[PDB]
Design a protein around this ligand. Structure first.
Ligand code: FEC
Ligand code: FEC
Ligand code: FEC
Ligand code: FEC
Ligand code: FEC
Ligand code: NA
Ligand code: NA
Ligand code: NA
Ligand code: NA
Ligand code: NA
Lengths: 237, 248, 233, 235, 250
């Protein structure tokens, strides 16, 4: 009955809110020293990316939920844990308050193939916007995904796939499975150069039976790509 | 599935004033920080006057917040830049974040907003007035988010289009009967925030908020399918109300 | 269809004893003096008929105090709240919950005016909770026909009548104003009457099937003397 | 309809060890002495029959301690709470949960057995269990829409289970409709903590709870007398 | 109708902590060392209790913001468990270990299936049963913890089911778990009366993806598909003394 999956990089979505009042009290010398240390940390992460042992990206997040997200991908939970712990021990991380996080593993569902590695070990596209949200499938009375027969689930997933293929080109998706790893069953990351495409695809999916009847959603997070010019501007008072 | 036209990107930024910290400042430094905020708001007025956005400030009743800063911009980048520049104001250390909402001004296709044809609606001046709304200086504001239910037999997203259209039509008739008393901005937020719409109402009589929201609750579109978040009510704040508000 | 009266704020506060204790007694006295001035101001608004207010001490950790204020506009209620938060002593009164509503009755008449603009009875105890009516499957209040709801409300009213002289109720409507649909304030000189009336109503179909309840807060009347004792540390 | 006895406060606290640790031992001793005089005053009220109180240490992070106090009026209970909060040591006792209720006897005052139940002596049992609960009002599972006779039968079967734990678990049922966020506060006392798991599991398979019970958080702990109270606070 | 009966072993604490890096960074290295020395002394005391057979314990570093560390401790009484918790909180270093979540439970073996022959024997004298009630913790690379309860929701009400139907549902769930022998080791802690859910579930594995595999497969089995209500999930990596010293080095 059960889905069987292929699993790739382990993923951390780390959402932080900047403690502006504390940061403002820091002398501008201390601020520069802490950003220099962060900049070294990010150069090391870029090395890991260039040799193909992981990926990462940073977006600034709208609204009060976060000021930024660090999305990091590694080939083991141990390497992910070490990134996280080294990040938290940066001086600047004392000013980066934790507001939400998500742990997942890039997932390919069965519903060395170079076309599989590309999905399992995704290079992150440098699109202007990111959207993240977690979700689960419902187990609620007669709307119970996990009691459906495989044939009916397969039909529902087929229809859902047709919609997303029509957004190829506009929206790039990474689906992280998180059963056993976090509080929902998937973490969904979307990338696009037009944020309205996130609204468009997620709305269209909500009227397809697989989501209309069976999706349960967490919080949504949207943001804008942060390279270094925007990162340094971000922190300048 | 519903199709939408989409206009300005919206931030409702709710803040609570840290009176105890503010009180610790001497009035000289308080004035300096208020001057910096006025300069900030003067810049926001320029953006408004060149047609690139809108903004307004209301004082909020109860402990949920003291103020809301409602800001509208033509891109997420611009909205993000306002937000970040605002948090970096000196006075913002005394404005504690208590809630926020991200949405985009939305016109659905459940009813027609213009004569059908190849003529594209973004060039229709009536449509543009709705997508890029002028904010009216009404005495009061009401904000809340909402979603449509997907709950057993009450599942909005499993209804056929013609049934959703009828439900929306009937909802619209009620709202139309509050013309001249309540003005509404509907921000779509599927993909952007935790509910599916952020609803902003404006009126000179706060009791019209209770009236319309109650009346709609007995209409099937809301009675059967609405799920509501928290409600925020407040009073218009111009400069007079603002420096007054911060005089301790 | 409802008639609407005073706008209401229930403002729950927990006292920051650790910080209060750090103040020398002279500064404590100055802050209490300021608070008494503010409260005498509130009493003046009451005595000219432009509002009401009362203060109860709250049991349990949810709060130490509730300030229940009623005013004739949202602007006036906002000004009171803001002037309150600017008192020096308010820095020691940490906000733990609040509720916004308007007195509701479903205008020249004196018995109506007595309901819409209620005098607050000096009863020993208070009980506050918000509630809404369910929209949940077959238990959907707002999908009922008019005449079915009228019958359900009728029966709930008979119960209330039997508590005349035991419990006095103020019902604030809050659709459009806060997170639930009504704020319910009860006053009695016997706190057990709160339990009795609210239990009795819970077996009546209007509440048994359709009520959704928030948190409950219960308290004891604070006059000037009990206020000074409260803060003596 | 019910009979109602003492008003009850369950007051859960976590100790601020970092701040307590900053105090020199003489000041720590002065604050504990003040708490000792407060508890000896509480013992006078207990000895005269005007209330009761006990203290248990609580397992896990929800609390370090529970102060469970019973008084014959809401005013007396409020006065205990406020005096407690104004103890110097209370700055180090952070409030993490509380519950207000009244000892309850349903019909599903001069009698000596009735009075022993309304105004209960707290047994010095090794362990305590506290949890609040309400009866469901959810579609076909609606306790408050049941006919009186069906409810009487469901309570009867529930009481049969409780009777079989006589001598193992002692229970205090506090009504809280009108007073706190659930409908009852349930306090269990036993010398064997597994009896809590046994009685609560067995009740959960009895229809009255299987269909109709809605539970809040559960707290368990160990009796703290004077001996153990001093060691709790010794760093 | 017929309630489950259980055998119950060690009382358990799952104690999740987040490290207050900002505060820890402000200590000079000499004082950090003293605090880590004291912690090592407390852990060697834990080890002594393990090595005389009166309890167990283990430490994992947790991924994500929910915690940096979990301390999982097992003891033969609630008093001993409470004493360990209180001594831990009074360590100097514990000021830097902020509480983010905890769970209290007791190692549970129910009677849905047999764990030993019904020949009249004391199950607590059966060494196989004892190995389960007083489990030695395996030094597997990864841990997974989550609490869960069984639904009492309309037509999906576990506690209204007949014994023989619950037994069938448990039986089928067990066959799935049996298929993960050698890949996932489970400890089931019962928590009815002790904490906010009905069980705490701890999984150990050298491959974290086996957690995802077993929990996903059980979620398509009726016992969980229809009746499970889950709390939060925590996953982590084994921490021995060496990884502990690295964790706290800035
Ligand atoms: C966005 C978004 C969501 C979450 C929102 C919602 O669920 O409402 C979303 C949700 C899910 C979820 C769960 C699953 C897994 C469900 C399960 O395993 O039971 C899940 C699984 C699949 N998705 Fe999915 N998605 N999705 C896209 C975007 C979104 N998708 C785009 C775009 C494409 C197309 C691009 C591509 O395939 O490379 C796409 C295609 C697939 C295919 C391939 C189908 C096919 O080949 O026909 C599978 C399998
Ligand atoms: C207030 C309020 C709420 C939220 C509370 C509740 O819905 O219970 C409220 C909620 C919503 C929600 C969601 C939606 C989007 C639903 C969807 O796209 O599924 C949503 C969408 C629409 N509303 Fe709405 N509303 N609303 C008014 C006030 C409120 N409205 C007033 C006033 C007018 C009248 C404007 C006028 O004067 O011409 C009005 C009209 C419309 C129209 C135009 C319909 C038509 O043309 O007939 C659309 C589309
Ligand atoms: C207590 C309590 C609650 C909340 C708990 C619950 O509803 O379970 C409570 C709740 C409500 C709620 C909502 C409503 C409005 C519901 C709606 O409009 O849909 C609501 C409305 C009414 N109540 Fe109510 N109550 N209530 C009393 C106490 C409580 N009442 C007592 C006492 C009296 C006795 C009357 C008196 O002597 O003054 C009494 C009477 C009325 C009347 C009488 C008709 C009239 O206003 O002309 C109306 C209408
Ligand atoms: C434990 C526990 C709970 C909460 C957990 C759950 O509900 O699953 C629990 C829950 C409740 C609740 C509510 C009520 C009231 C519900 C209502 O009035 O609607 C409630 C009410 C009663 N209980 Fe109850 N209980 N309970 C015991 C333990 C527990 N009890 C033990 C032990 C005895 C043994 C009695 C004795 O000491 O003489 C016992 C007996 C009674 C009687 C006895 C009446 C009679 O003598 O015929 C009444 C009435
Ligand atoms: C993983 C996981 C979960 C939680 C996730 C979920 O969806 O359930 C999980 C959840 C639970 C829960 C509650 C219960 C208690 C059910 C109840 O008493 O209502 C519960 C109870 C049992 N489990 Fe369970 N599990 N489980 C395994 C893994 C998981 N298990 C593995 C592996 C094995 C295989 C062991 C082996 O053969 O070596 C295994 C077997 C059993 C047996 C059979 C042995 C016995 O009599 O104790 C019982 C009973
Ligand atoms: Na932000
Ligand atoms: Na306010
Ligand atoms: Na209190
Ligand atoms: Na504890
Ligand atoms: Na972590």
């Amino acid at each position: 009955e059960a889905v069987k999956t292929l699993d790739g990089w382990f993923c951390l979505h780390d959402f932080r809110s900047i403690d502006w009042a504390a940061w403002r009290e820091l002398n501008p010398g201390n601020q520069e020293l802490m950003l220099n240390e962060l900049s070294h940390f990010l150069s090391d992460m870029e090395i890991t990316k260039n040799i193909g042992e992981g990926e990462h990206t940073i977006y600034s997040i709208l609204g009060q939920k976060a000021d930024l997200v660090f999305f990091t991908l590694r080939d083991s939970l141990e390497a992910l844990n070490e990134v996280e712990n080294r990040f938290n021990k940066l001086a600047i991380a004392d000013y980066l308050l934790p507001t939400y996080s998500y742990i997942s593993v890039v997932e390919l569902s069965n519903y060395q193939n170079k076309g599989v590695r590309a999905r399992l070990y995704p290079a992150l596209p440098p699109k202007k916007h990111i959207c993240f949200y977690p979700m689960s499938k419902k187990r609620d009375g007669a709307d119970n995904w996990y009691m459906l027969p495989m044939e009916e689930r397969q039909q529902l997933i087929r229809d859902h796939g047709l919609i997303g293929r029509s957004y190829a080109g506009k929206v790039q998706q990474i689906i992280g499975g998180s059963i056993g790893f976090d509080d929902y069953e998937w973490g969904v990351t979307l990338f696009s150069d037009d944020a309205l495409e996130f609204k468009r695809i997620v709305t269209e999916m909500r009227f397809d039976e697989a989501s209309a009847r069976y999706a349960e959603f967490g919080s949504f997070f949207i943001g804008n790509l942060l390279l270094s010019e925007q990162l340094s501007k971000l922190f300048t008072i």
